[PDB]
C-alpha cells in the first residue's frame, strides 16, 4: 500500500506493482537473533494483527567503537524472492534430533 | 590443553637404534656380557607425508577481513628466511585465527 499526505490528511491506496522481498537464512550466515527472547512474536490470539519487528544485529565492540574483527552484513547481498500481490512464499524445515522435553 | 588434536590412538611412536657391534672378544670363553663395542653411528633421510582435510569459509561478511601478512617495510633480513650466517629463524608465533564466524 501507498500512503500520500496532502495537508494533515493521509490517503492510502493499493500499489499493485510494488513488491515485497523475502528470504530465509538457511546456511545460518547471519547473526541469529531468534534465540534471544524478544517481542515481535506471532500473537497468541489468532485475531490480533501484529507488526513485524525490525532486524538488527551486534558485532564486536570496544566501548562504542568497533574493532577490525567486527563484521558488517548487507542483507541485500543474499538472494531473495520478490513478491507482488498474487505471489506467495513457502518453505519447509526439518528439526534435527533433539531430546524430548520432560513434561513430568 | 597445550593445543591440537586429542586422540585415543595418535600417530605411533617410531623407535630406532643402531644395533651394537662387538669389538674383538677374548679367545677364551667368558660368560659376562660384552661391554666392548665398535664406535658407530648412522644417518639417513626421513619422509613424512600427512594428508590434511580442509573446511572452507562460507562467510557472507561484506567488509574485508583480518589476514596474516608480511610487512612491506625494509629490514635487514627477510622474516622466515635464512640468516647471513645461514641460520633459519622463526620471528613470530603464528596462530590460526584470522577469518571470522558468527557466534
Automatic annotation (TrEMBL), chain B:
Domain of life (superkingdom): Viruses
Chain's gene name: cap
Name of the protein described by the UniProt record: Capsid protein VP1
Membership in a protein family: Belongs to the parvoviridae capsid protein family.
Species whose genome carries this gene: Adeno-associated virus 9
Location within or outside the cell: Virion
Amino acid at each position: 500500500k501507498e500512503v500520500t499526505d496532502n495537508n494533515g490528511v493521509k490517503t492510502i491506496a493499493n500499489n499493485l506493482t510494488s513488491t515485497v522481498q523475502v528470504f530465509t537464512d538457511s546456511d545460518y550466515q547471519l547473526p541469529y537473533v531468534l534465540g534471544s527472547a524478544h517481542e515481535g512474536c506471532l500473537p497468541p490470539f489468532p485475531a490480533d494483527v501484529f507488526m513485524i519487528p525490525q532486524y538488527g544485529y551486534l558485532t564486536l565492540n570496544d566501548g562504542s567503537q568497533a574493532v577490525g574483527r567486527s563484521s558488517f552484513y548487507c542483507l541485500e547481498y543474499f538472494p531473495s524472492q520478490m513478491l507482488r500481490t498474487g505471489n506467495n512464499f513457502q518453505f519447509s524445515y526439518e528439526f534435527e534430533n533433539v531430546p524430548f522435553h520432560s513434561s513430568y | 590443553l597445550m593445543g591440537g588434536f586429542g586422540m585415543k590412538h595418535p600417530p605411533p611412536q617410531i623407535l630406532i637404534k643402531n644395533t651394537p657391534v662387538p669389538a674383538d672378544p677374548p679367545t677364551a670363553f667368558n660368560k659376562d656380557k660384552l661391554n666392548s663395542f665398535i664406535t658407530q653411528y648412522s644417518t639417513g633421510q626421513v619422509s613424512v607425508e600427512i594428508e590434511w582435510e580442509l573446511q572452507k569459509e562460507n562467510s557472507k561478511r561484506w567488509n574485508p577481513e583480518i589476514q596474516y601478512t608480511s610487512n612491506y617495510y625494509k629490514s635487514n633480513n627477510v622474516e622466515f628466511a635464512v640468516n647471513t650466517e645461514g641460520v633459519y629463524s622463526e620471528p613470530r608465533p603464528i596462530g590460526t585465527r584470522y577469518l571470522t564466524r558468527n557466534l
